[PDB]
Every structure is written in C-alpha cells, then in structure tokens.
Design a protein around this ligand. Structure first.
Ligand code: HEC
Ligand code: HEC
Ligand SMILES: O=C1O[C@H]([C@@H](O)CO)C(O)=C1O
Ligand SMILES: O=C1O[C@H]([C@@H](O)CO)C(O)=C1O
Lengths: 126, 126
C-alpha cells in the first residue's frame, strides 16, 4: 500500500507510536498507581490487539529506512520469530484482560514489555 | 494518557496517518484498477473501524497544537458532530464491506471521503 519506501517507514513508525501509547498507558494500572477497571482494560487491550498486528506488513521488501536495522531483511526468519513471540504474548495479555485478573495482567504485561525490548535490542538502530 | 500536549498531538497525527493509509489503500479497488476480494476488504475495513475511533480522544482539553484549529475546542459541539458523522459513515462502509458488494462499497467509500474533507475544511489548518 506504499507508493515509496518512506511511506512504509512513516506507517510503521505511526503504528508503533500508537502501540507504545496503548501499551504504556497501562503502566500506572499494573503498578497500582491508578485504579483497575477490568472493562476499561479489556477494551484498551482489544485496541492494542489490533494495533499489535499492523507494523509488520510495513517492513516489506524494499522498505529499508528509519531506525530499522538491515538485518530485519537479511535475517527474515529471526525477525519473524521476534514478531511472533511478541504477538503470542499479546494473546496472553488479551486472555488476562478478558479474565479481569490484575495479577495475571501484570505478569502478562511484563512478558509483552520484554518482547518489545528483545526485538529492539536486535533490530532497532540505537 | 499523555504527559504533555505534544504527546496528544503526536498520537492523533499517528492515528490519522494510519487512517489515511487504511482508507486510501482501497482507492484502486473502488476504482476497479485493483481486484475486489471481499474478504480482503472486510478485514481491512475492520482495521479502519478500530482506527477511526482513536483520534478524537487525543483532542482532549489542553491539547492545542499541530495542525488542529483552536475552533475544535471553542466549538466542541460542532466538532463532535463532524466526528460523529464521519464515524457513522464508517459504520455504513463496514456494512457495505460485510455485504461484499462493490457498488455499495464505492458509494460508502465516497461518503466517508466527503466526511474527512468536511472536517478538514472547518478544523484543520491550511
Ligand atoms: C520487532 C519484532 C519489534 C517488536 C516486537 C516491537 N518493536 Fe518497537 N520498533 C521496531 C523497529 C524495527 C522499530 C524501528 C522502526 C523504524 O523504521 O524506524 C521500532 C520502533 C518503535 C518506536 C518508535 C516509532 C517512531 O515513532 O519512530 C516505538 C515507540 C516502539 N517501537 C515501541 C514498541 C513497543 C511499546 C513494543 C511492544 C509493546 C514494540 N515497539 C515492539 C521493532 C519492534
Ligand atoms: C474531524 C472530525 C476530522 C475527520 C472526520 C478526519 N480528520 Fe483528518 N485531521 C483532522 C485534524 C484536526 C487534523 C490535524 C491534527 C493535528 O493535530 O495536526 C487532521 C490531520 C490528518 C492527517 C495528517 C496527520 C499527520 O500526520 O500530521 C491525515 C493524513 C488525515 N487527517 C487524514 C484523514 C482521513 C483520510 C480522514 C477520513 C478517512 C480524516 N482525516 C478524517 C480532523 C479530522
Ligand atoms: O512502552 C514501551 O515499552 C517498551 C519497552 O520500554 C519495554 O521494556 C517500549 O519500547 C515502549 O515505548
Ligand atoms: O485518503 C484520504 O482521503 C481524505 C480526503 O482526501 C478525502 O477527500 C484524506 O484527507 C486523505 O488522506
């Protein structure tokens, strides 16, 4: 869907920004600093679910740029396992949110965050 | 969810960018230049549905900036009717996509586009 590689870069950056917001806005809740409203979090995690699937299609062939390391393309199978692990942890977060269980939510939240960082450590420029 | 007004600006700009992409990528399909796969479009419109609800919460009190005109806040009821009309036209687009009907899709697509422009004409800086 991208006329030029820069358009793919702008899309994925925007998608990832929207993820950081829907993920990070729950930090005060999982820390207990803000109240836990199970329905609120269920709805937010549904949004995060949808967003979490979007960036990866914008790293298609020919879309080198931004802060994406070139190894995303030369090690396509590894990069796909980091996105899959992340998306599988998002499924676990959705399950915790759907269950309305704050303990399970904070554990699942931590697993998601670790998956973000694992990908950044390998595939995002400094 | 925004520490500073600039964070709300960056969020809404990112959300709107993701909308322009999920909306605009269907242009070749509604023009007949690309093939119509009803399931493909149904899935894409489901993404657009979700995205279409996101920008508005990032024009909250105190978030003046970007290319948002100040009248968004001083004429809050008018701005809310432009976002509601847009979101109602998104519902009609979802119905067309769910029905798998290209005629209905192209009419609903046109109505959505007109609603984007109507809001821009009143509330987006030049
Ligand atoms: C690899 C499988 C990734 C996972 C999982 C996550 N992110 Fe990431 N992120 C990745 C790359 C390769 C990049 C660079 C993209 C580019 O072309 O520049 C990023 C970038 C971000 C950004 C910055 C976006 C911007 O506005 O420029 C943010 C805020 C970000 N990523 C956040 C984030 C979060 C919160 C994640 C888990 C919920 C996460 N990312 C996962 C690669 C990957
Ligand atoms: C008012 C109810 C709007 C409707 C409906 C749509 N948009 Fe819009 N858009 C609006 C404003 C006030 C702004 C400025 C935001 C800011 O703070 O800068 C915008 C901006 C855009 C952008 C640019 C985003 C960026 O990266 O800076 C795009 C690409 C955009 N809008 C597209 C768009 C489309 C395709 C719409 C219908 C599907 C649409 N917008 C509706 C206000 C409103
Ligand atoms: O909210 C965020 O979480 C991850 C990372 O900090 C998790 O360790 C990230 O990159 C964000 O923007
Ligand atoms: O794809 C788009 O459609 C609207 C407008 O052009 C409809 O007339 C808009 O602002 C986009 O970025």
């Amino acid at each position: 869907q991208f006329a030029k590689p820069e358009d793919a870069v702008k899309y994925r950056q925007s998608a990832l920004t929207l993820m950081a917001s829907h993920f990070g806005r729950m930090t005060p809740v999982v820390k207990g600093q803000a109240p836990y409203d199970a329905a609120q979090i269920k709805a937010n995690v549904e949004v995060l679910k949808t967003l979490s699937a979007l960036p990866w299609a914008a790293f298609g062939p020919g879309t080198e740029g931004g802060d994406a390391r070139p190894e995303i393309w030369s090690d396509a199978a590894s990069f796909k396992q980091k996105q899959q692990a992340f998306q599988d942890n998002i499924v676990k977060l959705s399950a915790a949110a759907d269950a309305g269980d704050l303990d399970k939510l904070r554990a699942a939240f931590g697993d998601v965050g670790a998956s973000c960082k694992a990908c950044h450590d390998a595939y995002r420029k400094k």
